[PDB]
Symmetry: D2
Subunit: 392 residues, 4 copies
């Protein structure tokens, strides 16, 4: 049998977009209220409250009404001005990409760059900051998803705080799937969204903003105002007694409401545990069948996405095509400099359950073997299962 | 009995957001696919096709992934260069607001402004274009919603074309509820969205872009690129074989797919007819019970929103609070200048049915009489019913 | 304009089926579990618990997996045996209809019958019971919906209890919309369902069963066992530790779960109040415009359905057709001996909000006037509104 | 990690109920219309048309408003008169169960019974019909689900027709998952429903009725009438111009509408192929890891359910509890005789995809090894994958 390209797949195991929780999809279907209906004004305020609780924030997170690339661009546009010297940390596609937005808003850019299967070394950060007292803003990506790797942002954030600089963190693909919060890494801007680990569709940004960041953005004549790119316009919009700068994405807010309830009710620690276990089982299976995890070391591999290095000679695009056509299972490609180099299996929200690692391993292995590899698929499944069975 | 503010209302008869069609709400709940899943790539292309058909467009409309203020801002940012001379037409809050975006991108701004219950006179536009042949861009709002009035954009577009200038049209609250299309008004950028008459929630922009406008923007090095404000980056994103600049709002796309089906299946002409009839019945009822339509003349009153002038001594906010608390019916406030001056009843998508004019008139009359007015509510209902029955 | 018969209507104001609450419709869409999945076993038990609480029952209500005609037939088949002498009380279609099932299961049938706009007189019941000590079973319909009238079942039930007979009550169209419970009327079998006032679709039966009824049915060799008509098979099915006689309607159970939550959370008294107010406003409007309520007296008119007598000479079928075609509003016909004699407007669940009485009055009046009547529609609306505004 | 019993599972791989298609679940959420609304009357007629097309029927199938045990009971009650001589065929729990209903309606019962992992031999049927020419009705189950085995109903039907007798077929767990239709087996009453392979919840029956069967039932004064058990009362209910005997399950009808669309649109042959392939892969995996398929021969194993024999000393209930608690995967128990003797993995509708056989095999193996077995799980996965790849 073959799955037609025009027909829906059986299991989507991608790293974004991802399958949304069924409850979230039903939440999207709630009656759409007028945004100034008192019932919606209250709901919106309470959604911000839920986000604050989930993010362990001392102040209100800002919800912006576009998917998190908006948050990233708006952060650069608002916080970075030409007086700033920015240190951008790049260990992958998103990290490198952020530097382009930094350069748009200040001509002064320093970077620490590592190959796209590595993590930023905190020692290198400490040394760079010491050598460059002029640095005023530092940007970092927590989980640089197209590589399936994690940066040590809490240690980095403490170094940056000691230096006296502002920290911008991209935690879009880590928040809700592992332990991370704005406070944990002394973030001044912490950008995330519900469209990865939290199991909602793309459309909203959740942004932690420090008091110091608020003061810097509000002072900056170049910060966007009366714009889609404005953070400052949205400062007070959480309040049931305040207007919205422009019309909020009402149905997405209904989805976010549900997604936050699911996360908070399950227990964040429990949610992080099943992401990590699914990922751990995946990696064990990958290695046992004869493939290589992309990450330079297991220690930096993400608990919310496994990137699998394409064996030299295998056509990675054809591989993903074969996994869907043969088994109905959909994986993510790489992106930018990781495109063609690896395949990504998301372990996010509803797919952060260890049984999905078993499904992913079988489709990935079967597709590899169809491309002429000689993987020990059974051995792979048994190693993944041993991880599941060993979990304490 | 009273409806508490925290509980859901019974009927929402606002002018944006509005309740979505039930089918659209179920559509939002479709399984969320990876955006590069071939089934989604096909779906997205097909949605652009449906939009092109609905908009009667000779080329592909662009879908942008934010609610329509994104399209308005992006149009200003891309089409208006610093050497352009912009004529902004202002008959209300949106029209006036656009001029501020124009001034952001060119220092050369001319404006025709009329009172906020009046319409722009095409003759005044012709007179201005004659006086200022250096004009290269003209911007206009079709339905300036906070006023419930309509501008003659086809007549205006003809004059703009006669003067060789570009035309930017805000048709966000008119498209789908009355006869209007990019090529009716010879628009170069025509901005709308499904969040008013089409009965979908806020989140997406549908933009008609003329081939002339494409050439102008692509040749403009200042047009946003690598930005949420970019139109040009989305030029080829309609195609199943092409990437998305950033992750599309998958669930909103699902809703839009359904909204377009509903519109195309019912028959656009039939859809426009019920909007106009609902509005006509509303206006007849308003006048008959002793109230006044805001619009300076009946001829310029919108078929998609009725604005009702607040009588002297009536607290408009308390009025809307009372309509909801007493009858569970929700109306829109004014905005800016019109805030506190009028009440708006939307006739949009699912609420563009004449029976809703009856419900609106009763709640509006009831709340007005609670505020000490002595309206002839029965007389209002009969006049509205007479309009319905005369079209029968 | 005209609403096509093939297209959906605008407002459904019928007396069964009725529009379901939006939340219920979303609840129907929950993932369908295996019925012996422990999570479903627990849900089912908790749904019975919720039904018990809603019904103020001292013991467990039985849920049967068909719409309430199943409950009625199963009650006759199980409780009535040929030794019984049944007194059937008939003031309408359902009441008379029940007698046919009684006669199927015992040849001994006495009846008290009144014309189909009247209520059973408790004095007549007391007298009949005194004259006939042989009576062992009495059947009564609480709200005989095709007439929009109410019987005094609590007084009747006390008379029946004093006599020593069993009481079977049909409360399908009253429970959840006015004060009534199995205990209130000393019911031995109390049949209801969520498909009227509770705002769920047709498919389930909720049945109160007295301990005495259990003993009588379980003793009866003729009571259905291993049958769709079996009550006795389902005695223990509420328990998470017990099997289901046959597969329960899983999605309907999910709907019922939501419907019970909505009722219990709103507060039953508050729910009954808005049914009665909607009905009271309806009746006031009907009389004020020049029509007649069907009920012999206002005191016996149902708070969950208004039946409006068809003026002599008007074609009632054509009238309902015209209300939908002209206004998009759907009313119920009569049934059996009330077909052609009256039109029914349901005030049930989501339509038990007074604003819907306003909509119903206008469509009903408009349709009547289109058929050549000369109703004072404005006066009708004003009288309905006066009721709403007077409510303390 | 462990999945608590009270929380939802991850994958339900049971043999009824089963998870519904997501589109069906959204379909259940359609607005509930009055059953005599012309749009519903049309919809209902169209659903019967779709069912007729799917069942390849020369006449209209009857939809009954209870889950398929209603159809089985009603078939016995209407088609079997006290003078009929019934031959019941029993290869499992459903088959044996039917004989009890036959005996309810005629005292003349003959039976062929085989062990509950075997199939009925058409030659044994021929031998019996020769020995007993007085036979007038024969009943058979196609897929006796608690055994996961299939009877050769087409061969049997041919012999029943050769002897001039009526044939009643239970195809509830086979129709839509393999090639089978009323006219394939020359059925007089063919009972199925959408709650197994068609991927809709329990609540409706789809019954094929031969013209000969119509004549027999209509001439039978004992056939249920004015009863939930009545087939004859529903004879003309398909028509938009005709009443319903009692209120149809409107939301279940909406679900069935979608289920039929999905089946017809995918292509019945393609649907059957994926059921069979999933089952084939499952059986290969079961055998390869060291377990045994229940069926006496592979040839009689169902393409819609795999039954796996419980090894000696393994507690089957604890086994299923462990599969769910460890891996979040839910299997069916046996039933009656087979309870405690086997475990069932459904391959039905949405779960008839081969990747689910992989998930099932892993959870089943994992739970068996937890119970102290020493299965070669990797070997099982590879054998299942080999089956998939060989069909590729």
């Amino acid at each position: 049998m073959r799955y037609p390209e025009h027909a829906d797949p059986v299991i989507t195991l991608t790293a974004g977009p991802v399958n949304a929780y069924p409850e979230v999809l039903r939440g999207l279907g709630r009656t759409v209220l007028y945004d100034y209906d008192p019932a919606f004004q209250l709901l919106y305020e309470k959604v911000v409250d839920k986000a604050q609780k989930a993010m362990r924030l001392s102040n209100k997170p800002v919800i912006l009404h576009g998917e998190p690339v908006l948050g990233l661009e708006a952060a650069a546009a608002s916080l970075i001005s030409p007086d700033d010297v920015v240190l951008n940390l790049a260990s992958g596609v998103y990290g490198k990409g952020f530097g382009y937005w930094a350069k748009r808003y200040s001509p002064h850019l320093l970077e620490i760059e590592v190959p796209y299967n590595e993590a930023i070394d905190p020692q290198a950060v400490a040394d760079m900051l010491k050598a460059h007292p002029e640095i005023t803003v530092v940007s970092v990506c927590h989980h640089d998803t197209p590589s399936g790797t994690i940066n040590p942002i809490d240690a980095i954030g403490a170094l940056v705080s000691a230096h006296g600089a502002y920290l911008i963190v991209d935690a879009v693909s880590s928040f809700g799937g592992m332990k991370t919060h704005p406070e944990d890494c002394k973030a001044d801007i912490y950008v995330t969204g519900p469209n990865k680990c939290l199991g909602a569709p793309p459309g909203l940004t959740m942004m932690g903003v420090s008091e110091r960041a608020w003061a810097k953005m509000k002072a900056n004549p170049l910060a966007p105002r009366a714009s889609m790119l404005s953070i400052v316009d949205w400062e007070n919009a959480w309040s049931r007694d305040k207007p919205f700068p422009f019309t909020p994405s009402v149905s997405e807010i209904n989805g976010l409401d549900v997604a936050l309830d699911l996360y908070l009710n399950e227990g964040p620690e429990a949610v992080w545990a099943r992401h990590a276990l699914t990922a751990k089982a995946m990696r064990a299976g990958v290695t046992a069948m004869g493939l290589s995890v992309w990450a330079a070391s297991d220690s930096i591999a993400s608990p919310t996405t496994t990137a699998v290095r394409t064996p030299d000679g295998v056509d990675e695009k054809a591989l993903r095509q074969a996994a869907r056509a043969r088994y109905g299972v959909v994986f993510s490609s790489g992106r930018g400099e990781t495109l063609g180099k690896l395949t990504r299996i998301g372990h996010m929200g509803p797919t952060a359950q260890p049984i999905y690692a078993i499904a992913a391993l079988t489709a990935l292995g079967g597709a590899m073997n169809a491309a002429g590899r000689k993987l020990a698929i059974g051995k792979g499944i048994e190693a993944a299962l041993a991880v599941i069975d060993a979990d304490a």
